[model samples]
Every structure is written in C-alpha cells, then in structure tokens.
Target chain A: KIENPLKSLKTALNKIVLVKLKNGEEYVGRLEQSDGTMNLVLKDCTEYREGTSDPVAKYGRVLIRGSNILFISIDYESIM
Target chain B: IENPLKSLKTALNKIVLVKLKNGEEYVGRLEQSDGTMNLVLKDCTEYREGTSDPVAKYGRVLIRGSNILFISIDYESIM
Candidate 1:
C-alpha cells in the first residue's frame, strides 16, 4: 500500500519498540510520523542516527526514516 | 594485512562492494572500472544479504559511489 505508514503512529503513545538499524544500532521509541521529506519519529534515538550518531537535537523531532532500518519490532497491541 | 594486494577476490572477476558516503553505503557491481571511478553495472554485488529471508536486493540501488573509496560486506557479514 502507498500509505505513509508512520502517520498511523503516535509519539510516546504507542508501545515501546526496538528498531535495529542497519549500521548496528538499536532505536527504541514510539513510531511517530514522517513528513514524507524525512522520518519524524519519537524514540530513544535522540540523535539523527546519522554518522554513528547525529549531533544532539531537540526532542520535538529528529529524522530517522532516512537512516537504514535493520529491523522493527513492536508489541502488536501497540499497532500504532 | 594492510597490503596493496587486493587479491581477497573472486580472482576471475570483481563482483560487488560498497562505498560509504554521508554515512550511507551503496552496494552494486562494477561495470567499468578505473583507479578512481567505478561504474556499477547492476547496482548490486556478488553477495547481498539482509535480515529479511530474501537476503537479496529486489530493487534499484540507493546510493551511487561517486569515487572509488572503500568497500565492505553486507549486513550479515559486517565484521
């Protein structure tokens, strides 16, 4: 489906998740949203998850979708 | 083993490799090569494995190596 996928998600509202990054790192948080230009998710991945890790930024948002995703695991009940 | 001997190879042909840029890596095969720039014939490699069962690229490459720099393995053999 051509859905945004992240839209159905809610920040700090969904169950805690563990998204393994392709570069060998894990992102734990609630799937938030993606403006389509970049990923807009809320997670323990405070950094951009960019080079090893991005420079610290605001908690309101940090781009994650552009980063290579290794794996994403959710609690099923938190199907946000 | 920091030798110029790039013989950790198929020996017969150069298959696949990656060049990292902006902290992103691209995987593809060499089409035509040079000391600097190497064109990816298929934007893939001799070996590409993912966590997904397919473990293969079923689509276009994400990044194109601008300059021949470094090379690496897939997520499976990233060590």
Candidate 2:
C-alpha cells in the first residue's frame, strides 16, 4: 500500500486542473501529461497573474518544467 | 577594492540575466541590489519556458532572491 501526493496528479490526468508557478503565474487547463519529475503538459491553458482574475494568455498547449511548479489542484467533482 | 561587492559595483549599469528556480528568466540592466540578492532591474524582459518570444517586459522591476536560481553578467553585450 502506498500513498503519494503525486498520485493525485495521475488521477487528474486528462482532467481540468490548476497549476501555480513560483513566478506568480497561474495556469488552468486540462492535464495532458505528467512525469515522475513532475514536468507537465497542459492543453487549453489559460494563464493569469496569481491572485488576480484577469487572464494574460491562452495557449493551445503548454509545457511546464517540474522545478517551476508551486502547486496543483484538481476539481474532483467535475471529473467525477 | 578586492571584494565581491567591488565586482557588483563594477557590474552596475551592465546587462545581466537572472534565472529563477521556476524556469523563468529575466534580462535587464543592473540597477540596485543588496547582499540578500534582492535586485532592482531596468529594462527588464521576462522569458518563460516553451516560449520563443519574451513573455513580457518592464521598465524597471524588483526581483526577489527567493525565486532566483542564479545571476549571470552578460559580458557578450559589451563585446
């Protein structure tokens, strides 16, 4: 039996998720891919300045480095 | 005259690149900084992962050390 915080990421696959970067940028989109190192590829991504509602950019697909990740959240009910 | 501060003093008004742990980078002229690595940069251009063009720019900005991975002086600019 094992429980890892990262397992949540696997459960979140292909589901909408929110990722926040250390640089004060937040991205919300579908989790396309995730690796052991925590690197991620998101689709239909909308970028925004952290703590603000305004969006800055929208990308069809985006790659985010593992080291740059601050946190990630999944809306479980929406996918359920 | 033989200390790191002296080097920073010399680097003032020079172009430098600051890389952050978050995979974002910024290029700007060194404006002001303290021992803590908190820096004020002028003419800042922000570079992000997976982007060929600069994501944004600021006339001046304060970069916090907590987010920084390293800082490199761009001597090539003077070359």
Candidate 3:
C-alpha cells in the first residue's frame, strides 16, 4: 500500500534513470529499489553538477530522499 | 482500508527512515508525530548524499514537516 504518487516509478525498477533534485543537483544511476515514500536506492550512481556536464562523484550505492527529488528522467537515448 | 497514515501510526516506536527534500536522509527510531507530519526521532543517524559519512547519532530530534519528502518504515535490517 504505497501512498506516494511516485510509486508509479516502480515499473521502472532496475532501469537507469536520471534523478534531478530541487537543489539543482542531478544523479544518474540504476534504480535498485524504492519504498512507499519514494526513498531510492541507486547503484552505480554518478553525480552531475548542476547546469553542467561534469561528473562530480560516484557511489556504489546511494539512498535518495524522496522530498529532494524534483523529477526522474530516463534518458538512455540522449546518453547514447 | 488503504490509509497510509494508519500504516505510519502502526510504525510508531519502530525503526524508520526520513528523507527530506534537500537530498538528506535520516534513520532513527520513531518517537512521535503530529497530524502535520512533523516528527520526533530518537537515536537518529543522518546521511548526506554529497558527504562521505553519516553523523554519529541523535538523542532526539524534531524534523519539520515542511522540509519532509516522505517517511519509510525500514525493514531491510530486520525483514
């Protein structure tokens, strides 16, 4: 019984997606899991500095708090 | 029968995770909550994705509802 509307993304599980945060940071990673609150567990995560294309950091696993997420865009085509 | 708030209420005193809108995460024992979504957590551990380590611990902390994204009952450690 996931209450958050973001639960729709469950269908996109394990897929690579780009997560944009309200603070202007962006993260790209493989979605490992998410819970009812949309808190995300990501793998092979890469961080992109805001308004730029520089890779700032990488994490093997990171948990993204749902409130910070502005939106998630799956842009495999753009990456290719 | 699918009320999410009810589920949250049932999770009181349990280990929970609070994720805020600023990409910060907190894990702690659920101590108290209000109708407005504000929370009080005990023995909290804070995580910042941009940082390398979590803060040591919290005796008790109040998290404002306005800064909240959502709350999760963590079952990974004990499920």
Q: By DockQ, who's the top model here? A: 3
Quote the B-chain TM-score, candidate 2.
0.76
TM-score list, all predictions: 0.29, 0.50, 0.49
lDDT of 2 by residue, B1-79 (tens): 2332334445578876665775676778888987656789999988775343789988899988556644544332531
Q: Score chain B of each candidate by TM-score.
A: 0.38, 0.76, 0.79
B1-79 per-residue lDDT for model 3 (tens digits): 5333455565589776676776676778888987556889988888765454786677799999768755654432442
Tell me the spans in candidate 1 whose CA falls farther than 4 Å from its real position: A1-13, A34-40, A43-60, A76-80, B1-79
True contacts kept of each: 0.00, 0.00, 0.07
lDDT (10s digit) by residue, model 1, range A28-70: 5555433332233443333234334443322222224433555
Backbone N/Cα/C clashes per model? 2, 0, 2
Give DockQ per model, in order.
0.02, 0.03, 0.09
lDDT of 1 at B44: 56
lDDT of 3 at A42: 65
Q: What is the CAPRI rating of model 1's predicted complex?
A: incorrect
- Per-residue lDDT tens digits for candidate 1, residues B1-79, read 2111122122113344443433333344434443223344453532322211223453434343343223432212222
lDDT of 3 at B59: 71
> What tier of docking accuracy does candidate 2 attain?
incorrect
User: Highest lDDT: which candidate?
Assistant: 3
